[PDB]
């Protein structure tokens, strides 16, 4: 699709539509909430799995204990390099995984619609369907819900496919 | 979900301090433990959420902490309004909630 | 803040009942409504769950098939229905707010219950 | 009739980075890196810190004249020193095992300032009144440490000391003392008799004999001599003894203490204020729960892991690309 | 596909054979062996790459070396936090990627079957394919092997499709 | 005719967590966390440990009278101590570089007890039969360390002691000795008719002079004085010289040893058994190929890394859901 | 799809081309350029996100500082094993995602053309599209460019479909 | 007429690994592991190292006669030693805090040798023209260190030494000295008067008194005695005082320094060449931008972390699978 919807009031995914009864964004609340639950679990796993312990960082050393001070600095620098590399790399990898997940979720709703309509609509190529049926609010609401009684609608879709 | 309130009955005068120990059979994250007060004649009110955070609008007298399978609710002073019954709440990932039985509070 | 419950209902053993609870200062679509039964030997028994976002529910494992719930935004009520009851189910049935249901939860406040209702009772003793 | 499959967009300007693309704008993000702080030092684990202000740790534990106004809490979670911390020791010298002592007095579960050897009872044969120096005057009066006293000869006589303490307390006792190193032999005789002096201090585990090191030193303060400082812990039920014929500076006060989980020392000029946190940084208290911060890495408490990144954000929304 | 099968004891992946001559379950041995070798290699890579060395973790110190003992503790705690955080995020990520792999490595075989049976069967969408042509005892081997023979059946299948 | 595609399911009870879901069901899983152990201490790298049973390192290496019943191993991988290992430095004192000695002795490929200074010929001018004390008697009778001889005056005299040893072994020789610090000057004179005394010990790397510190200490094990312990490693081809006028406790036995840089010291009450392992923890030997363990943070040998996780099962199998 | 090509060096992804006016391979440079920029971005993130500070590894210890030398050795071995294990898993996992990414890009191009050709070309299943209608160099260049004027060819394609 | 979609393949043999498959051949890959090096030691951060091909650090810094051929520079980034560099102290003894000095000398921005106490002026009552033992002769001439001078009696007389120095430079100055420990009292009288000698050295921070340890040692380098070496850093404006009645080896030269950064010492026989590197490894400089290396665990400077691996190739291309 060309881009996201700035006019939708809620949700993350939805079924923007226009028909003879009006138009609207019709946010997909069930798949959005499922995505929210999994992403919430993901962020809570990243945050809560840090088993931060009560400890004191920093030690006082004398002028004749420079090798120990440099060992302490070595440890602090090594842990800083490991945590900086792993935290930044984890963020880039996890963000690639998260955006790929979200794009696959949109693909999953699109695929759901394709399996439900069963050639009763044609693809435009930018994530949209053009209906053969004059599809009113009940029709679209049923499509959003995931119920579509294909054989009673298919007679009109067949005639409209013959017409093109 | 198994929640056990160890002391059974707490009988202490106002001005002292007391604790309630809630033991879980399954080790869980701290995010899912909450503490509630039930004054008879009224509705329950939230006291603690997240096993440590302070509920909105409650005095500093009520506190608590815990981890793993052992969580403690700590009540300072024990004012006359506090001699009611307390419940231990547990959530387990899925939208499933439970409450314990609590303990008797007496002067 | 502070959910509204009113009009205690008294019926008969072996008959269906209906319970209600109204939202206070909220948008309704950013939380669910959870019920808790108060009874002499139960203390607080989590009964019911609903989410005013998805329409999904986890009922309760031991009571599945005896409780049905649906939301209605127009009047803002939980609109609980309870059927096939005996007499041990007499309880206060307090109303409370549950999960955030619509944003990432980074605050443990969105798992804990708060803003309990007025506790309208149901008695089935006839 | 059209059915469009798409996603939410908003006016958010928060961006995230990915392995394949940088500066990716998202509708929502969660910041994993804390870049803000309270700017104040506060209570740690519910217990206030011990704030020394202008006093150093040596100054406070020794009772330096400039620390008389410094009230000591019965317990503290950590010690705060200012950037201008001074007036620690006054008679110049090498404080032996000073870093170890600073490490031991980090977080203390109980700390009572106890009088071990009363001034007018324990030393009837020595003068406890003339032991003063110009290194640390109080209002110009030429004073000395409050916790230790410097004994000098009384009537050109310095009998041998055999004072001991039985530690009938239930906690460990920290006993401090020092050894005086006069500039020359003439000062050793002027100040003490028995010029061939020795000092012995010990407990069941620790014992050591000390000798004066008489030599002229470079000038520090206005006195070409040195005062070395020592300390030891006395176990409950154990006996600590002090024996000396000369250059012993004896404790008058000692501290009974029960140590808590290891903590540390914060060097900061930030004022101390009332708050309740779980980790305290020299730059200010941290109020977050996030796994990482970019705040200065010598923190005390249950602190997140320092990361040098300027931003760490996890995406929790979709690409905010309108069209 | 609503869920998995308990009849299909031997092999992670396979097919349900059913016709008027017989029925049963059988493995897709090529895809199962490929998944098994790849997962075994994944496990061997996770375990083999640990650079376990002969060490003596934990040092004892005198009471006058408290700063060094605390440095040893700091090192042990830092390594413990690093290994715990990375092990837990590694296992959680590998578990999500493995389960996604398994779903991809069954859906892609479903699609493979679709590519083999493009017009002689109607897919239902739940893993079941409704055949229009008569199935003999070699149709199942053809599906497992691939190179589904369209000329062998041809118009017969569309002759049933034309009914509706 | 209908054919179906699906996936394997079975009666598995093993669950896994993921970043997106928790408590998922897996047909088969490989547990990457080792939480089991033998419960017994065993041989490490094919060489049995030195099991002290009741003895401390100081006791065994010095030869405490209650420690004579232990066998003498020619080699060991690691040393096992009990929680009751208080039989150590029976005559109270400061064991110098004790922790370093424990570290050096933790793993030895070849070890032999060699008599460095023969009892009947090396000290013809001193009394080697006395020196037994009540600090650690054996069978109710006063005794002393097996590996050390406390020399005292032969009778109204303590002749100058000067005894060297040339290391004719091909391995390093660990030589132990001690310095006696009497409580009073009467005790010094009674044991050593020399008043002021000194001890000198040296090698090609080590050279140090000691001086008795005569003073009354707190009474520990009925003793008022102290005995300090020293040790050194003599390289093959080098020599060690003991020169003293008194207050020297001289070795009788010394240990020839080829040191490794492997194991450490385990303090545990777990019994010793016969096993072929690569890793030993205080709770028992570990037999595993897994990358992680949650058994104990103190680990000896080539074992998995210790984590605080209680479950790290890898979802190597397929999602197990009914249908 | 089923193997690589050695006939072209201009880019990673491309097409086979045989037409009325000649043959020869050519890359689709927009997709190729996007893939190289993203892979370069990944490589640059792996290298630039490694934090380096001016320090020194290795310390001189005496013969009476064996516990400290062993502590330094412990720190060096811990950091060495942490970096080795994380580096090896990073490489193995990044090679997996990179190869799957490349396969996804190939399928994305496959679908890009498939969704434009629709029923006007025979799908072979091995990555080859055999057009029912004739297509000279201009037709092929229009397909490769990313825009196909389907309504101008569907009459010839359907007539050729009827005869096959 | 026909189109088919595919991808580039070539004859490259570069092979990558995955978690799912090993030895996967790809058309292109980028190395993340640096396995090559220059094989030469080069300048670090644009400033050359100080190379002590024959001398140890004790040898060079003390002015051992064999070190006259070494170069002098105002700054260096690290110190290079070889496997044959064992010419350190020539008069055997324990160089006190030697490892700390080596750590502090690893990187100096303004290193200059300055004559602190002119040999022919500062000590008019002592014999500065002796103090030679032939432990380190110069062309067989029986000589001694060039940076320190060993004072002996002026002829049956050793007046008390009280020489001091005021640091009037803006940089820290390192002052070295030593103390002689003769084999016997006959040697104490042969070189020095005042058999009961003492040495005192101190600054505003450092104050230590020493006494000789007169004893027979194992014969090392034809000497039966020892000489201990000491050092201190005198801050700008500070006063260092040396007082002695015998057994003191006094500085002639002192080194003005400004410590710049942490660094280290490389032990390597690799020749030094003029190349601009970012770090130096004992086997040769690593000119690289990659995150990992498998060349040596102990490098100096800003370069890859050591990984115990042979291959870390991150794939960029496609599977190299020709038909
Ligand atoms: C039923 C059948 O023909 N199965 C074939 C088998 O005969 C052949 O050897 C194999 C080669 O990949 O492919 C499959
Ligand atoms: C929505 O789908 C459910 C699925 O069972 C069905 O029961 C319900 O009637 C549907 N509602 C509408 C309005 O299509
Ligand atoms: C976006 O616009 C809404 C309009 O009400 C406003 O409330 C919100 O704060 C804006 N957000 C940003 C990031 O501009
Ligand atoms: C991302 O934004 C920062 C801040 O403006 C800028 O410096 C950087 O070059 C940007 N990178 C890209 C790829 O746009
Ligand atoms: C929390 O802060 C308040 C400040 O008014 C303080 O009184 C209270 O003691 C603090 N909490 C604890 C546990 O100390
Ligand atoms: C306290 O320290 C300041 C620091 O300049 C000094 O001037 C002052 O004399 C000191 N006073 C005492 C009593 O130590
Ligand atoms: C400290 O953090 C808590 C939540 O962790 C927050 O409610 C509180 O407001 C914070 N303190 C301040 C001063 O904002
Ligand atoms: C599953 O059932 C089989 C019997 O069919 C039994 O042998 C096996 O042990 C069971 N496994 C589990 C984990 O229940
Ligand atoms: C996981 O789910 C199963 C039921 O599918 C349940 O028996 C088990 O207790 C659950 N485990 C946890 C940790 O919640
Ligand atoms: C393994 O255990 C057996 C016990 O019978 C023992 O004889 C053998 O020596 C052990 N292995 C090694 C390498 O010592
Ligand atoms: C060994 O330790 C025990 C501890 O109870 C002690 O009683 C015993 O006297 C010790 N052995 C000797 C020889 O002192
Ligand atoms: C360790 O376990 C393996 C099986 O995983 C077994 O074959 C081997 O004998 C075991 N070793 C010991 C010493 O028990
Ligand atoms: C080829 O692609 C470009 C991309 O902008 C487009 O503008 C042009 O119209 C395309 N060619 C045809 C024939 O449509
Ligand atoms: C691949 O082919 C090119 C063609 O010139 C050749 O230069 C290159 O060396 C070949 N690669 C290998 C690894 O032989
Ligand atoms: C991969 O190639 C290397 C060549 O060094 C070889 O040693 C290794 O065994 C090969 N592995 C496989 C699985 O072919
Ligand atoms: C690089 O080497 C040249 C030649 O030695 C030198 O002049 C230049 O300063 C070096 N680069 C830097 C940054 O110092
Ligand atoms: C310098 O070089 C050799 C080689 O180690 C050494 O044996 C010799 O004693 C030294 N000579 C001196 C410092 O005069
Ligand atoms: C070092 O590597 C860089 C690339 O990172 C290269 O540009 C430079 O020329 C190299 N220098 C040497 C001396 O190899």
Residue numbers in the entry:
A (entry chain F), E (entry chain B), G (entry chain D): 10 to 173
B (entry chain H): 22 to 128
C (entry chain I): 2 to 127
D (entry chain E), F (entry chain A), H (entry chain C): 11 to 333
Article excerpt on this structure:
A core issue is that hemagglutinin (HA), the major viral spike protein and seasonal vaccine immunogen, preferentially elicits antibodies against its hypervariable regions, limiting coverage and compromising pandemic preparedness. Broadly neutralizing antibodies (bnAbs) targeting the hemagglutinin (HA) stem of influenza A viruses (IAV) tend to be effective against either group 1 or group 2 viral diversity. In rarer cases, intergroup protective bnAbs can be generated by human antibody paratopes that accommodate the conserved glycan differences between the group 1 and group 2 stems. Differences between the glycosylation positions on the group 1 vs group 2 stem also impose steric constraints that hinder intergroup-reactivity to bnAb supersites.
In the mature antibodies, contact to the group 1 stem is greatly strengthened by S32R in CDRL1. N55T provides a ‘fulcrum release’ to accommodate conserved group 1 N-glycans, enabling dual recognition of group 1 and group 2 stems. We find that N55T driven flexibility enables dual recognition of group 1 HA through a mechanism we term ‘fulcrum release’. Here the group 1 IAV N-glycans at positions N289, N278, and N33 from the neighboring protomer interact with the antibody LC, tilting the antibody contact angle backward. Achieving this clash relief through a quite minor shift in the organization of the antibody paratope further underscores the low threshold for expanding this bnAb class.
